[PDB]
Each structure stands twice: as C-alpha cells, then as structure tokens.
Design a protein around this ligand. Sequence first.
Ligand SMILES: O=P(O)(O)O[C@H]1[C@H](OP(=O)(O)O)[C@@H](OP(=O)(O)O)[C@H](OP(=O)(O)O)[C@@H](OP(=O)(O)O)[C@H]1OP(=O)(O)O
Ligand SMILES: Nc1ncnc2c1ncn2[C@@H]1O[C@H](COP(=O)(O)OP(=O)(O)OP(=O)(O)O)[C@@H](O)[C@H]1O
Ligand SMILES: [Mg+2]
Ligand SMILES: [Mg+2]
Length: 246
Amino acid sequence: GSFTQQPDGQYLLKPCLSHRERDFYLHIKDDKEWTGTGIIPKFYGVELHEFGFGELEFIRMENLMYKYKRPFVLDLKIGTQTWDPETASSKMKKRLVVDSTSTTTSLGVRFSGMERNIGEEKPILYSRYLCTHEVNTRDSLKEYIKLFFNDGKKYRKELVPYFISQLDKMIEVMKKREYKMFSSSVLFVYDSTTTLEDKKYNCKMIDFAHNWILSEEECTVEDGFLFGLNNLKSILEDIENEFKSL
Ligand SMILES: O=P(O)(O)O[C@H]1[C@H](OP(=O)(O)O)[C@@H](OP(=O)(O)O)[C@H](OP(=O)(O)O)[C@@H](OP(=O)(O)O)[C@H]1OP(=O)(O)O
Ligand SMILES: Nc1ncnc2c1ncn2[C@@H]1O[C@H](COP(=O)(O)OP(=O)(O)OP(=O)(O)O)[C@@H](O)[C@H]1O
Ligand SMILES: [Mg+2]
Ligand SMILES: [Mg+2]
C-alpha cells in the first residue's frame, strides 16, 4: 500500500516507512547466502530522495517482472501468525481471525492474491481475501497454486522444479534462526511467453517491514516461517506428482 502496486521498469523504489525492512536488507547485504543465492530481490541500496521538507529513505531493488509480456503473479504470505510484537491493538482481532480462518495457523502459509494474464487482458485478478473462503484448506491452496501454473492453454509443469529449488535455498538459510519475519511473502512470478531458457520466472522472499534481527533485539513470539516454507515445498512436490498424470 506504500506505492501503486502495478511492472515493466527496471526497479522498485520502495519508501522506508520504518527501520525494519531497510535494516534487514543492510544486514544481509554482505552475506553471500542471502545475496548470491537469488532468494530475495537484488538490493541496489538505500537512497534518500527529496520528499516533503527534506528527504525520505527508499530501498532500491529489482523489479522482478521487468520486461514481462504476460505476467502471472501469486503472493503467498508465510508464517503461522501475521501479527508481531509491534502490531497495533486495533488490528489484532482481525489478524487473529484471518490467521485462524485461513491456512496460516495450520500450514504456516496462505494464499494472498493472484493475477493471471491469459490473452484477454486486462488480466484475471484473484483477491487476497479468498484465503478465508475459497482457499482456506491445503487442498484448495494446492488447487490455486496449480491455477497459477495454468497459463490459459496448459499447465507449465516444467517451471515447478525451479520453484522448489528456490524454496530449498530459502529453507537452508532460514534454518539458521537469525531473523524472524512476519507478514512477509514468497512471490511467484513468470511471463507466460517465456521459455525455460529465457528465465522469465522468479521466486523470491519479499516484504520485510516486520523483520526482527535476533542478534540485535528480542522477539519472543514465533513466526513459524520455516514450518510454512516446508509446507509450501510439500505442496509444490505434490503438484509435481499430480502434473505427471497429464
Ligand atoms: O487495516 P489493516 O488490517 O492493516 O488492513 C490492510 C491494509 O488495508 P487498509 O489500509 O485498507 O485497511 C493495507 O494497506 P496499508 O494500510 O498497509 O497501506 C493492505 O496492504 P496492501 O495495500 O499492501 O495490500 C492489506 O493487505 P495485505 O497486507 O494482506 O496485502 C490489509 O490487510 P488485509 O489484507 O489483512 O486486510
Ligand atoms: N521487487 C519486486 N518486484 C516486483 N513486484 C514486487 C516486488 N516487491 C513487491 N512486489 C509486488 O508489490 C506488492 C507490494 O509490495 P510490498 O508488500 O513489499 O510493499 P507495500 O505493500 O507497499 O508495503 P509494506 O511493506 O508495508 O507491506 C507485492 O504484493 C508484490 O505483488
Ligand atoms: Mg503492504
Ligand atoms: Mg505487507
């Protein structure tokens, strides 16, 4: 909500509305395990740009859908809760209900919006709010992720291994227990006009406004992040299995 949410320019220049996202990117900046692994957007740096009477800090990162012709986008919110120690009390009844009535508390992952461009664009939009009704079980989440891989003509089964490979790299780094992340997402994207060789597909962790750096501060509550990644990987592996019957 801090910028118009739509992706054929090179960058995203995201405003720093608090310290957390910028501190996270700065903290992982020299760690090849975060920056050489391709699991978060390429981070260009924190920059000041004129704003108001002075300057506002922004994060400059890559636009993951740069030059995508027919973008497919799926945002999956990770964790067994989406509130954190700083969440405003006026938001908490809703946060608790949405967490318990989606797949968040059970799986540590939930559907959080999709866009499919099947030739008749403007594209088909799938509301993030579907998580508490249409996409409120493991089975239905699996179905909606399959729909992500449906380009309007066929299931892009050949892309699924990439996505699992990305989740593995995420799992490997998130076993280290150095950060807790709340309301962060794994963003799946591809251009349906892509071939495997074009590499116009991507799977990245995003949205670090509620990240806690455990070597610098206390965060007692659990995020269930690794649990969610493992469940999501399990769903993708089931999908690989299911796509062989095609
Ligand atoms: O009031 P909250 O419970 O935090 O609800 C918000 C919020 O919507 P409203 O401002 O309309 O209530 C968001 O926008 P901001 O206020 O943070 O700008 C939005 O974030 P996005 O605009 O980035 O989508 C978001 O949705 P989400 O974080 O799920 O994408 C959503 O939370 P809910 O989706 O749970 O209503
Ligand atoms: N690097 C990126 N490349 C392409 N799309 C992105 C990128 N980062 C985010 N997006 C898209 O923009 C949406 C919003 O991004 P994000 O949630 O990071 O920011 P925000 O909603 O403005 O602020 P907050 O961090 O407070 O939620 C995402 O759901 C995703 O669809
Ligand atoms: Mg937001
Ligand atoms: Mg957010």
